[PDB]
Design a protein around this nucleic acid. Structure first.
Length: 50
DNA sequence: CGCCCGCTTCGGGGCAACCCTGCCAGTCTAATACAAATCCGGCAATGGAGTCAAGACCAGGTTCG
């Protein structure tokens, strides 16, 4: 945003223009997939799930 | 008078069980203009490769006077 806000022209930008949500959605997806904490949920009885 | 030999402190790299069991990671002026390379799609130089059909012939078991 601060790389974009200074560079582009004033009285033409809008919050849709300044905001790139792609790092946010990529960050959540790379947490949920591919982290050592978001585990494949082990269930072969209810107790192992619990 | 000024000047360097042992602690001493600090950096700084190496290593710390063996089988299984997994399975694929990213973004910001945007375009023209052109020349050469190269692909590629299609007739025509063939030209050689394959193919049919007839035939030449020996002779070798097989048929006849």
């Amino acid at each position: 945003v601060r790389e974009r806000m200074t560079t582009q022209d004033v009285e033409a930008i809008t919050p849709q223009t300044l905001i790139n949500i792609r790092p946010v959605v990529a960050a959540i997806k790379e947490f949920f997939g591919t982290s050592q904490l978001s585990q494949f949920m082990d269930q072969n009885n209810p107790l192992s799930g619990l």
